[PDB]
Amino acid sequence: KCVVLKTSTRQTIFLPVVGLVDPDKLKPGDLVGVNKDSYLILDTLPSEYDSRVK
Amino acid sequence: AARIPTVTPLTKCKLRLLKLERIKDYLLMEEEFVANQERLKPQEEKTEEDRSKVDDIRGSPMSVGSLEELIDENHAIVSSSVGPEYYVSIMSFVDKDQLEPGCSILMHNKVLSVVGLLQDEVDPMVSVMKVEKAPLESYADIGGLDPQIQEIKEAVELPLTHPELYEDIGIKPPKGVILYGEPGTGKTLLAKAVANSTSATFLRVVGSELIQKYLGDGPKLVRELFRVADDLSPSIVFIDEIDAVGTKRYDAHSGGEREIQRTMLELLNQLDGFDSRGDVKVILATNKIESLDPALLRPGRIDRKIEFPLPDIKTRRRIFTIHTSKMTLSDDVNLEEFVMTKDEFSGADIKAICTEAGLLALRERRMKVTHTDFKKAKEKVMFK
Amino acid sequence: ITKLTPTTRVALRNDSYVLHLVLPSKVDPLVNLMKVEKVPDSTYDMIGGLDQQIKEIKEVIELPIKHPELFESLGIAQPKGVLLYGPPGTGKTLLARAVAHHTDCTFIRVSGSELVQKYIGEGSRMVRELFVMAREHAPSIIFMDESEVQRTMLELLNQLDGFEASNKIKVLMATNRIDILDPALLRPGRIDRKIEFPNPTEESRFDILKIHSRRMNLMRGIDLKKIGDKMNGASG
Amino acid sequence: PYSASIKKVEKEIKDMSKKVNDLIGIKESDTGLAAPSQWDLVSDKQMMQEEQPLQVARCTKIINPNTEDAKYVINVKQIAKFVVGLGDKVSPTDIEEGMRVGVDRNKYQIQIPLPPKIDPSVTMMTVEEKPDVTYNDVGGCKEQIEKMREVVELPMLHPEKFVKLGIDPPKGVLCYGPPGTGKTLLARAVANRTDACFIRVIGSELVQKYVGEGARMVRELFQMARSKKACIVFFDEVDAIGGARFDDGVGGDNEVQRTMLEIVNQLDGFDARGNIKVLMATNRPDTLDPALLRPGRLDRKVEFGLPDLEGRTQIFKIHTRTMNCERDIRFELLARLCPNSTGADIRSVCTEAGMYAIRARRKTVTEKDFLDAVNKVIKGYQKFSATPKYMVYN
Amino acid sequence: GPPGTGKTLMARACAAQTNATFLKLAGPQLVQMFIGDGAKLVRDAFQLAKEKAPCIIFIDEIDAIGTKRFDSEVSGDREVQRTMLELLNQLDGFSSDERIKVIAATNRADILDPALMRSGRLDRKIEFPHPTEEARARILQIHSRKMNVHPDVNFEELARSTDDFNGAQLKAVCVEAGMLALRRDATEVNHEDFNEGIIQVQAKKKASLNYYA
Numbered sequence A: 001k002c003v004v005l006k007t008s009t010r011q012t013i014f015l016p017v018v019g020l021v022d023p024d025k026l027k028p029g030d031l032v033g034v035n036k037d038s039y040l041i042l043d044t045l046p047s048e049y050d051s052r053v054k
Numbered sequence B: 001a002a003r004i005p006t007v008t009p010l011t012k013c014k015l016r017l018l019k020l021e022r023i024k025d026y027l028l029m030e031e032e033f034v035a036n037q038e039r040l041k042p043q044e045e046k047t048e049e050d051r052s053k054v055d056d057i058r059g060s061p062m063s064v065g066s067l068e069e070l071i072d073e074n075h076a077i078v079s080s081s082v083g084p085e086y087y088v089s090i091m092s093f094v095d096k097d098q099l100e101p102g103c104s105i106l107m108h109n110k111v112l113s114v115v116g117l118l119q120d121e122v123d124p125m126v127s128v129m130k131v132e133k134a135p136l137e138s139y140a141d142i143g144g145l146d147p148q149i150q151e152i153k154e155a156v157e158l159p160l161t162h163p164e165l166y167e168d169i170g171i172k173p174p175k176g177v178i179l180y181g182e183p184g185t186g187k188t189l190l191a192k193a194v195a196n197s198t199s200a201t202f203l204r205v206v207g208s209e210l211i212q213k214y215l216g217d218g219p220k221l222v223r224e225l226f227r228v229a230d231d232l233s234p235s236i237v238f239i240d241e242i243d244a245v246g247t248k249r250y251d252a253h254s255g256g257e258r259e260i261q262r263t264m265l266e267l268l269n270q271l272d273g274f275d276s277r278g279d280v281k282v283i284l285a286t287n288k289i290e291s292l293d294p295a296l297l298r299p300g301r302i303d304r305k306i307e308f309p310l311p312d313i314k315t316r317r318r319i320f321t322i323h324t325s326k327m328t329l330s331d332d333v334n335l336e337e338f339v340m341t342k343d344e345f346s347g348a349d350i351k352a353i354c355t356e357a358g359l360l361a362l363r364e365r366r367m368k369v370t371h372t373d374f375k376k377a378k379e380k381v382m383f384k
Numbered sequence C: 001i002t003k004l005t006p007t008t009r010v011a012l013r014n015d016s017y018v019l020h021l022v023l024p025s026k027v028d029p030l031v032n033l034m035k036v037e038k039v040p041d042s043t044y045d046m047i048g049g050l051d052q053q054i055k056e057i058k059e060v061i062e063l064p065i066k067h068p069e070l071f072e073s074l075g076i077a078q079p080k081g082v083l084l085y086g087p088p089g090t091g092k093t094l095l096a097r098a099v100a101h102h103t104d105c106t107f108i109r110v111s112g113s114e115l116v117q118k119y120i121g122e123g124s125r126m127v128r129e130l131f132v133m134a135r136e137h138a139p140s141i142i143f144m145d146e147s148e149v150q151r152t153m154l155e156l157l158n159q160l161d162g163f164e165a166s167n168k169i170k171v172l173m174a175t176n177r178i179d180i181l182d183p184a185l186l187r188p189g190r191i192d193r194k195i196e197f198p199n200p201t202e203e204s205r206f207d208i209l210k211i212h213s214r215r216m217n218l219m220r221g222i223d224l225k226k227i228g229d230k231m232n233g234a235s236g
Numbered sequence D: 001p002y003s004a005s006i007k008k009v010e011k012e013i014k015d016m017s018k019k020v021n022d023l024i025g026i027k028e029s030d031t032g033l034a035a036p037s038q039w040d041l042v043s044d045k046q047m048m049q050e051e052q053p054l055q056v057a058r059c060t061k062i063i064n065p066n067t068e069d070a071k072y073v074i075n076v077k078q079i080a081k082f083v084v085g086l087g088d089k090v091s092p093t094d095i096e097e098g099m100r101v102g103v104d105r106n107k108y109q110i111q112i113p114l115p116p117k118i119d120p121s122v123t124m125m126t127v128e129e130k131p132d133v134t135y136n137d138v139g140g141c142k143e144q145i146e147k148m149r150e151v152v153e154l155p156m157l158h159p160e161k162f163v164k165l166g167i168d169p170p171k172g173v174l175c176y177g178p179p180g181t182g183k184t185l186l187a188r189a190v191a192n193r194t195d196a197c198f199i200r201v202i203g204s205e206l207v208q209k210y211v212g213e214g215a216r217m218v219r220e221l222f223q224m225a226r227s228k229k230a231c232i233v234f235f236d237e238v239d240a241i242g243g244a245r246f247d248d249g250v251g252g253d254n255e256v257q258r259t260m261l262e263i264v265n266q267l268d269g270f271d272a273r274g275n276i277k278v279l280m281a282t283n284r285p286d287t288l289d290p291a292l293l294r295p296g297r298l299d300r301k302v303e304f305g306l307p308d309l310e311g312r313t314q315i316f317k318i319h320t321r322t323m324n325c326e327r328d329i330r331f332e333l334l335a336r337l338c339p340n341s342t343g344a345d346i347r348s349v350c351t352e353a354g355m356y357a358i359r360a361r362r363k364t365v366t367e368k369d370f371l372d373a374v375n376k377v378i379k380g381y382q383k384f385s386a387t388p389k390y391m392v393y394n
Numbered sequence E: 001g002p003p004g005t006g007k008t009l010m011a012r013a014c015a016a017q018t019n020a021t022f023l024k025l026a027g028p029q030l031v032q033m034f035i036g037d038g039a040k041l042v043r044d045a046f047q048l049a050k051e052k053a054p055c056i057i058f059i060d061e062i063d064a065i066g067t068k069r070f071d072s073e074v075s076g077d078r079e080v081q082r083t084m085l086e087l088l089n090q091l092d093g094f095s096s097d098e099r100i101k102v103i104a105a106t107n108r109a110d111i112l113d114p115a116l117m118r119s120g121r122l123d124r125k126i127e128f129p130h131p132t133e134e135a136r137a138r139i140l141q142i143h144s145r146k147m148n149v150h151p152d153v154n155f156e157e158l159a160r161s162t163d164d165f166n167g168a169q170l171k172a173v174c175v176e177a178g179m180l181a182l183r184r185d186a187t188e189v190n191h192e193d194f195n196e197g198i199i200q201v202q203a204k205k206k207a208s209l210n211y212y213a
């Protein structure tokens, strides 16, 4: 019932409400999209590994 | 600025006067054409309105950036001093001639457009090896041998003396001259004369200085010395103590023998690589050439071979009469007595004996030097 | 602008980054290196049983300090090399310290560390880094404790041998096993003079005791002569 | 007669020239500023057009887009990653995943694509100017010249015979010989001869400091080559990049093995370089690794040795094409007076002959002068001679 | 096996053979100056391979990471050993997977670290030797599949003249003959042409053959 996430700029911030996808939709270690303006997680980036392996 | 380079007349002939009159007439016509622009449509001061508008257009606070690529058409890619790569374009006063990686490009403060270039006054490698003042007096202060003085002159100064004599013969100066001789033979004294007589840039390189502690560093130091000397100006760079390539082993460098070997290979490449080094001369000396890498000496990288022997019994006279020119020595002793004191008294031996005699005279604060002072200096010099 | 010393701090506005005021005394890198060194400042009157060596060091270097015209009348070259050798730390270190003390010279003794390298230069490719710090503090002396040590010393000696055009620069290297030094450094023109620190005897320890115990709380009556007799010339 | 009349008039004109040029403005020496008659365009409109119109649009790196929509991903090496999109002035076929491009400084949207970063470490290593070594100036190795041309020039000169013949042209060439035998003197020849780009990889130019920081340079060089149409990469002193693998006990001399392996991989197998011909030159090839010399990567193994009897004559004829010497000189007798000498030795002999002739009084070289020069260059400098220690190739 | 005994050919055949996605990884390719960056590059490799369950990953020149561990204070390629350990962990053991197969190619099995050959990490060890006499002629038939030569060349004869030659050099003899054929401007390749090409491949210059008749 809690939301915990860290920005890509060495900044960590949490939202009392998960967002667009409920915690059932998400799992630890995931990488999703959050609002740069509202600092609210909007969507979930599907996947992207380093192009070196790609 | 470079209006006319024709000075071939060098006399009072009418041709020189006619050329000067034509130049003056052209200058007057240009001035008259330019004056009417302000007389008819000045439209501004053109002296400070332009400068003020440029200052107010380009960002007033100009930062210290770094150019890393080249974009000719109103664009440029660099990295912010904080780190963020930028796509700053080119401004009107760009004068894009220093568009090379590393030169800081100053961008605007409002829009961060390229405002100014970064005048560079560092050259760390060159500075840590640039000779500011002449080391010693003229070649006459070397004394005695002059078997290489003519040879070294032809190798270095003769190309710079009047490089038409070697041009009229249809050849280029010798590649390089390596001065190898007995310990304390005066090789450094030869470089002293080379510098006191030299005309172009000269770089001094400590022999161990080519071997660094971090693996891969030594080749970088060699490449940087080559860039600095070559890219700076016509130079005569002497890497003294070349025997230190592999002779001495130090624990500071992570790499073992395959690091001195890599440094030597890099030096060889920098001497006779795959491009045109330009007008650069090299004069290196060593006291133990028996271990120097054979490839670094093949005719084509180090051409002239010079050997310096100990001062001759006839040359010892000139050496002594030189190193004691200004000494107020008493006539009690005769230098020839100590001239044969040492069976193998090298050039450094005479200077050491003179210095010891001076010191001994000093301990008693006497005005002149006596024979006993020289006798006591001779034992303290050779015998230890 | 001239008063604004280059490589010095001045105040800077925030919204404009315009000059606001000078900054008085920010820092001196050589002072920081010396403080890291923590040199044991001494006094010439506290020198233990090396009086003749004291005059030798004076006559070795200091003479062209209070009387630069001394060698001009005789036409001799300025002495270059002075070294401290003998039993380790036999007072030779203290003699070196007292030399600068009574001579007023910039003391810099290095052990080839890496933290001080952050003040000499970014990479310290050559040994000329220290000279830059000394080059502007002409009233300076160079001291080096006891194989790359010789290499740095070899470069220094070659540097201050005619290639270094600055006059009145003194460097002194101290170490033991003079017969184990570098033969290249053994050139007669490199070491201008040599001084050794022989193990003090009772005749020398008496003053050593008078200096060392001078700062202690003794008992009425000392009788240090017998104790020094019990001291069979150990070291300084 | 009027010595002061003309000098004063000339000085007056020279002073007035500056007195009038200072009235337009060239003075006030700046620190990287252009001529006021060089930035005139940007005064009110162009500056308001070169500045007001455009934006910085800082460049960054892309990761990959997401399907079902544009769904591009924005990533910054030093700033931050982010979900962004391209601009209205880009195509959706060119959405390269992992592409360097700039995004709208405000909209944080990629408005302009960019070519891949150059890594100036391997960008500075392009020739850009062929040497002054021509075919007529590298005489003495005619067979080697033909063999090298068949691999670098002939195959690209008329690429019609090889297609009709039905055989893949030979891949590369390795030139291993005694020191000074003419390796670089021909590599410069290859560079000044053809037109395809030639990359000079100095054998020391690949040993980097960090662990693996050197191999990456190999990949960078290989990419910068494959980027162009046809490339010929000439590496000298190939004895430094990697000799072989001999690890025993404590790991030593292994890092160079990784660099050599990376160089081999980009050179053979897995969609090999293709339109890139290798031209290496080792001076002590005895240590070359079996994998690098194995055919298919450096198939040709041409060797350049000492000219026997006519090579010396050709070297004398070529290297002495601009020397003022007596016409009655017998050069072949000189070529017979040098049992085993290197071509660089022949050029140095011609030089020393020039110097000796210029020494005392002469204006043209003399046969006796060349003879005396031989006695010192070969017969006098024979102490090392650089030949005996490398003749066995060890 | 030998330097050119043939491993790239087997890998390229396997790639076009199976109806899946093959993973191409270069031995030294998986490294970086960052501390452990190679570990991350190998973990991402294993994840991308798990992406398509039907797939094969080939780690060519496995000697780059398979270097035997050493005991020394100063150096020893601790990062390289870390990458090797990461590959070993990702291969089999704690939280391994049975969905794909990896084909590895190493040129000197001796330098290979002992762990790299530990059953779980690698099960089947296949060593490829050089063709002796019959595959020596098969190589010439294959590599000369498109080469046009008149029926005046004895493939077996050239195979017997090509003693102790590698498959790569065996096929390169065909290229050398084709280039010599272009030198001759003819249309077909003569037996003497292949004989001269075999000699040119050896790279043994004759110089006054009198000391040994």
Ligand SMILES: Nc1ncnc2c1ncn2[C@@H]1O[C@H](COP(=O)(O)OP(=O)(O)OP(=O)(O)O)[C@@H](O)[C@H]1O
Binding pocket: B272, B295, B298, B300, D137, D138, D139, D140, D141, D178, D179, D180, D181, D182, D183, D184, D185, D186, D281, D282, D283, D315, D318, D319, D342, D343, D344, D345, D347
């Ligand atoms: N066949 C030749 N024709 C003309 N000049 C030659 C020839 N062989 C050598 N030279 C001369 O050799 C010099 C350049 O060749 P260089 O000595 O660099 O060869 P190298 O084998 O690459 O040497 P190293 O391997 O020691 O670097 C020039 O002076 C060049 O004129």
Ligand SMILES: Nc1ncnc2c1ncn2[C@@H]1O[C@H](COP(=O)(O)OP(=O)(O)O)[C@@H](O)[C@H]1O
Binding pocket: B142, B143, B144, B182, B183, B184, B185, B186, B187, B188, B189, B287, B311, B319, B323, B346, B347, B348, B351, C187, C189
């Ligand atoms: N006339 C002379 N001939 C030779 N050496 C001389 C002469 N006069 C002085 N010297 C001494 O030669 C030395 C020059 O350095 P050098 O002998 O080249 O040292 P090294 O051989 O150890 O590199 C100095 O010690 C200098 O005093």
